Design an enzyme around this catalytic site. Sequence first.
Site, PDB file in Angstrom:
ATOM      1  N   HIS A  62       0.780  -1.249   0.000  1.00 22.38           N
ATOM      2  CA  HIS A  62       0.000   0.000   0.000  1.00 22.38           C
ATOM      3  C   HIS A  62       0.821   1.314   0.000  1.00 22.38           C
ATOM      4  O   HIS A  62       0.294   2.378  -0.355  1.00 22.38           O
ATOM      5  CB  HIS A  62      -0.928  -0.043   1.192  1.00 22.38           C
ATOM      6  CG  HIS A  62      -1.676  -1.341   1.309  1.00 22.38           C
ATOM      7  ND1 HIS A  62      -1.343  -2.312   2.227  1.00 22.38           N
ATOM      8  CD2 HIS A  62      -2.711  -1.843   0.590  1.00 22.38           C
ATOM      9  CE1 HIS A  62      -2.163  -3.337   2.096  1.00 22.38           C
ATOM     10  NE2 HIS A  62      -3.011  -3.073   1.117  1.00 22.38           N
ATOM     11  N   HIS A  92       6.280   7.273   5.529  1.00 24.39           N
ATOM     12  CA  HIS A  92       5.835   6.765   4.266  1.00 24.39           C
ATOM     13  C   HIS A  92       5.199   7.886   3.478  1.00 24.39           C
ATOM     14  O   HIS A  92       5.077   8.990   3.972  1.00 24.39           O
ATOM     15  CB  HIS A  92       4.828   5.639   4.477  1.00 24.39           C
ATOM     16  CG  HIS A  92       3.600   6.086   5.167  1.00 24.39           C
ATOM     17  ND1 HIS A  92       3.503   6.135   6.534  1.00 24.39           N
ATOM     18  CD2 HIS A  92       2.481   6.636   4.681  1.00 24.39           C
ATOM     19  CE1 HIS A  92       2.341   6.662   6.864  1.00 24.39           C
ATOM     20  NE2 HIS A  92       1.698   6.957   5.752  1.00 24.39           N
ATOM     21  N   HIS A  94       2.120   9.032   0.265  1.00 18.70           N
ATOM     22  CA  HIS A  94       0.981   8.803  -0.593  1.00 18.70           C
ATOM     23  C   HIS A  94       1.213   9.650  -1.839  1.00 18.70           C
ATOM     24  O   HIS A  94       1.687  10.783  -1.723  1.00 18.70           O
ATOM     25  CB  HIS A  94      -0.318   9.225   0.097  1.00 18.70           C
ATOM     26  CG  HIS A  94      -0.516   8.563   1.432  1.00 18.70           C
ATOM     27  ND1 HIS A  94      -1.282   7.431   1.600  1.00 18.70           N
ATOM     28  CD2 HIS A  94      -0.014   8.861   2.644  1.00 18.70           C
ATOM     29  CE1 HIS A  94      -1.259   7.075   2.877  1.00 18.70           C
ATOM     30  NE2 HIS A  94      -0.464   7.911   3.516  1.00 18.70           N
ATOM     31  N   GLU A 104      -3.362  13.342   0.565  1.00 17.72           N
ATOM     32  CA  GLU A 104      -4.540  12.933   1.313  1.00 17.72           C
ATOM     33  C   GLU A 104      -5.263  14.166   1.845  1.00 17.72           C
ATOM     34  O   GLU A 104      -6.424  14.367   1.522  1.00 17.72           O
ATOM     35  CB  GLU A 104      -4.115  11.959   2.410  1.00 17.72           C
ATOM     36  CG  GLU A 104      -3.434  10.712   1.854  1.00 17.72           C
ATOM     37  CD  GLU A 104      -3.646   9.522   2.738  1.00 17.72           C
ATOM     38  OE1 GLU A 104      -3.244   9.565   3.919  1.00 17.72           O
ATOM     39  OE2 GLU A 104      -4.276   8.561   2.229  1.00 17.72           O
ATOM     40  N   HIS A 117       4.159  11.310   5.471  1.00 10.74           N
ATOM     41  CA  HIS A 117       3.659  11.106   6.822  1.00 10.74           C
ATOM     42  C   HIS A 117       4.752  10.536   7.693  1.00 10.74           C
ATOM     43  O   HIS A 117       5.239   9.435   7.427  1.00 10.74           O
ATOM     44  CB  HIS A 117       2.472  10.168   6.822  1.00 10.74           C
ATOM     45  CG  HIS A 117       1.264  10.784   6.227  1.00 10.74           C
ATOM     46  ND1 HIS A 117       0.210  10.046   5.753  1.00 10.74           N
ATOM     47  CD2 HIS A 117       0.945  12.079   5.998  1.00 10.74           C
ATOM     48  CE1 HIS A 117      -0.709  10.840   5.257  1.00 10.74           C
ATOM     49  NE2 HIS A 117      -0.304  12.079   5.419  1.00 10.74           N
ATOM     50  N   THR A 196      -5.314   6.736   8.018  1.00 11.25           N
ATOM     51  CA  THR A 196      -5.931   6.885   6.704  1.00 11.25           C
ATOM     52  C   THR A 196      -5.925   5.597   5.873  1.00 11.25           C
ATOM     53  O   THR A 196      -6.383   5.608   4.730  1.00 11.25           O
ATOM     54  CB  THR A 196      -5.278   7.998   5.885  1.00 11.25           C
ATOM     55  OG1 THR A 196      -3.982   7.592   5.481  1.00 11.25           O
ATOM     56  CG2 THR A 196      -5.220   9.320   6.684  1.00 11.25           C
ATOM     57  N   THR A 197      -5.430   4.504   6.452  1.00 12.96           N
ATOM     58  CA  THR A 197      -5.655   3.161   5.887  1.00 12.96           C
ATOM     59  C   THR A 197      -6.258   2.316   6.996  1.00 12.96           C
ATOM     60  O   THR A 197      -6.121   2.647   8.191  1.00 12.96           O
ATOM     61  CB  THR A 197      -4.384   2.448   5.408  1.00 12.96           C
ATOM     62  OG1 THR A 197      -3.644   1.932   6.532  1.00 12.96           O
ATOM     63  CG2 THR A 197      -3.502   3.342   4.583  1.00 12.96           C
TER      64      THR A 197
HETATM   65  C1  LIG Z   1       0.724  -2.072  12.027  1.00 16.43           C
HETATM   66  C2  LIG Z   1      -0.541  -1.548  12.713  1.00 16.43           C
HETATM   67  C3  LIG Z   1      -1.698  -1.464  11.723  1.00 16.43           C
HETATM   68  C4  LIG Z   1      -1.459  -0.277  10.767  1.00 16.43           C
HETATM   69  C5  LIG Z   1      -1.232   1.065  11.503  1.00 16.43           C
HETATM   70  C6  LIG Z   1      -1.046   2.268  10.580  1.00 16.43           C
HETATM   71  C7  LIG Z   1      -1.867   2.379   9.466  1.00 16.43           C
HETATM   72  C8  LIG Z   1      -1.752   3.434   8.579  1.00 16.43           C
HETATM   73  C9  LIG Z   1      -0.809   4.417   8.781  1.00 16.43           C
HETATM   74  O1  LIG Z   1      -0.786   5.433   7.823  1.00 16.43           O
HETATM   75  S1  LIG Z   1      -1.289   6.897   8.120  1.00 16.43           S
HETATM   76  N1  LIG Z   1      -1.497   7.485   6.695  1.00 16.43           N
HETATM   77  O2  LIG Z   1      -2.516   6.830   8.864  1.00 16.43           O
HETATM   78  O3  LIG Z   1      -0.184   7.487   8.803  1.00 16.43           O
HETATM   79  C10 LIG Z   1       0.027   4.374   9.917  1.00 16.43           C
HETATM   80  C11 LIG Z   1      -0.093   3.279  10.809  1.00 16.43           C
HETATM   81  C12 LIG Z   1       0.774   3.231  12.039  1.00 16.43           C
HETATM   82  C13 LIG Z   1       0.238   2.251  13.094  1.00 16.43           C
HETATM   83  C14 LIG Z   1      -0.034   0.918  12.432  1.00 16.43           C
HETATM   84  C15 LIG Z   1      -0.399  -0.202  13.403  1.00 16.43           C
HETATM   85  C16 LIG Z   1       0.451  -0.468  14.640  1.00 16.43           C
HETATM   86  C17 LIG Z   1      -0.113  -1.787  15.179  1.00 16.43           C
HETATM   87  C18 LIG Z   1      -0.777  -2.380  13.970  1.00 16.43           C
HETATM   88  O4  LIG Z   1      -1.421  -3.415  13.995  1.00 16.43           O
HETATM   89 ZN   LIG Z   2      -0.069   8.007   5.514  1.00 14.48          ZN
END
Ligand SMILES: C[C@]12CC[C@@H]3c4ccc(OS(N)(=O)=O)cc4CC[C@H]3[C@@H]1CCC2=O
Ligand SMILES: [Zn+2]
EC number: 4.2.1.1
Length: 258
Positions: A62, A92, A94, A104, A117, A196-197
């Site tokens: 993603h 990361h 987008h 975003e 981000h 945001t995911t």
């Molecule tokens: C790996 C993850 C799921 C995905 C989570 C996530 C999803 C999107 C993401 O992107 S965004 N655009 O919201 O910053 C950042 C993170 C950081 C924590 C991440 C989580 C920490 C514990 C877990 O199960």
């Molecule tokens: Zn992000």
Amino acid sequence: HHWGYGKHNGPEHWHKDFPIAKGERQSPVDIDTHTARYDPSLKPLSVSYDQATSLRILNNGHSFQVTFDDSQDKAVLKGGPLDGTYRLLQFHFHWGSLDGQGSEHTVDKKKYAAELHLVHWNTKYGDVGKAVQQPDGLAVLGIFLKVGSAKPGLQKVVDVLDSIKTEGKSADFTNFDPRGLLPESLDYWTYPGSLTTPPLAECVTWIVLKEPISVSSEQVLKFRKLNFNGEGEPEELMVDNWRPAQPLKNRQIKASFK
Ligand SMILES: C[C@]12CC[C@@H]3c4ccc(OS(N)(=O)=O)cc4CC[C@H]3[C@@H]1CCC2=O
Ligand SMILES: [Zn+2]
């Protein structure tokens, strides 16, 4: 099925597996600059990345992410709208299929070519999994990318992307300094929101910098050569991996600046 950004599994489908997608503090949002209120009580952001330890670069199907050692307070965010100290976990991006989309957050409905981000978690919760279950668990620093002059500090990232083309691939990525990705000004907007995911958890204090960074067409073109797919599957370019703006609902966006 497994979620993504396409017609059949993209953002409009996410609520079926993650019903919080229709929640009260979802991200991203449009930042309406004339309605955001200057809050003179907001503190300058404190970005302390001198001792940052990057570890790996990873294609997760993603985005791609650069991961940091978050087992000690080496690269931390504090101040601004935050209480306490937040450790840098990863950054990361987008981005779009063309320069007119990819961010975003939007600013007065303007979309940028990409958005960086930097993801941090509140040390009072001990680990990031715990933190994502808390309304003040994460702080994400958001930086817009426009296309023009190259960003020298991004080039080390761009040059290794050939080695992580497909989902699952990773590489060593030590001694990367994320300070080379920051704009001059730390003027910011802030609001309470979400990941945001998936899982779209409502755990994020968003800090979005007003000043974009410029990257070159050549740099962003290398992002667009990544693949959503795994190595032996039909090639599907990793582009347009952004969630659209969500309803602001009962929220106020605050500005650190006049
Ligand atoms: C790996 C993850 C799921 C995905 C989570 C996530 C999803 C999107 C993401 O992107 S965004 N655009 O919201 O910053 C950042 C993170 C950081 C924590 C991440 C989580 C920490 C514990 C877990 O199960
Ligand atoms: Zn992000």
